[PDB]
Structure 1
């Protein structure tokens, strides 16, 4: 149900957010696909914390396509799996443009948020 998904996301937020000096409005906006254009590293590294928590960012700091697909199939309602997978496919190479894995995580999520703002949700 959406409550199971939302509660899951809140859990990840609560584990990651305290470790970073994020601005409250900026953190809140991510849940509804509102991604600041050029935020400070606190918000970007929060996004990495979340990716690592979802187990989709490796130790080496790459975002795994297969692991993100699997998370999509497990966590999303059947009516949302298709756009999420299309978003992932559209944004799969965003990470190759950034050396810093906080940028990799943040701008890959931002890519997905820009691509499908009506559906994307971030912890």
Structure 2
């Protein structure tokens, strides 16, 4: 995946997920630049779950599949983001176990990624 293909994938994942939820574009803009420092609505949390379901890296219960996420990295991120993404996944592989509710499990995993990344981090 090239960087151009990655940037395109962000918008195509957004376009598949956003229309299923009542969201604020401003909130999406913040997640897109890796800024998760605000209380998410329930729909925003479930949007992060929708995105992760599209990648196949969570199940319906919001449980994160770290082995699958790691194996899928070459298909999800460009080469220049591979090592940073691997370390993010490893740092956050168990985050979901700390929460009871499906959407929140995914949201908190994504927030954990955002805290264990570099400046290349972007969320769809």
When the two structures are superposed, what TM-score results if normalisation uses the length of structure 2?
0.91
Contact 1:26 1:36 in 2 (8 A): no
**How many angstroms does 1:79 deviate by?**
1.9
The secondary structure found in structure 1 opposite 2:97 is helix
Alignment-derived partner of residue 31 in structure 1: 32
RMSD: 1.4
Q: Give the distance between the partners of 2:73 and 2:16, measured in 1 at CA.
A: 20
Alignment-derived partner of residue 81 in structure 1: 82
Alignment-derived partner of residue 113 in structure 1: 114
Which stretches of structure 1, 4 residues or more, deviate above 2 A after TM superposition? none
Is 2:48 the counterpart of 1:50?
no
Contact 1:73 1:81 in 2 (8 A): yes
The secondary structure found in structure 1 opposite 2:13 is helix
The secondary structure found in structure 2 opposite 1:79 is helix
Structure 2: stretches of 5+ with no match in the other structure: none
When the two structures are superposed, what TM-score results if normalisation uses the length of structure 1?
0.92
Q: Give the distance between the partners of 1:72 and 1:89, measured in 2 at CA.
A: 12
Contact 1:83 1:116 in 2 (8 A): yes
Is 2:19 the counterpart of 1:18?
yes
Q: What is the total number of aligned residue pairs between the two structures?
A: 123
**How many angstroms does 1:117 deviate by?**
4.7
The secondary structure found in structure 2 opposite 1:96 is helix
**How many angstroms does 1:60 deviate by?**
4.0
Q: Give the distance between the partners of 2:26 and 2:40, measured in 1 at CA.
A: 12
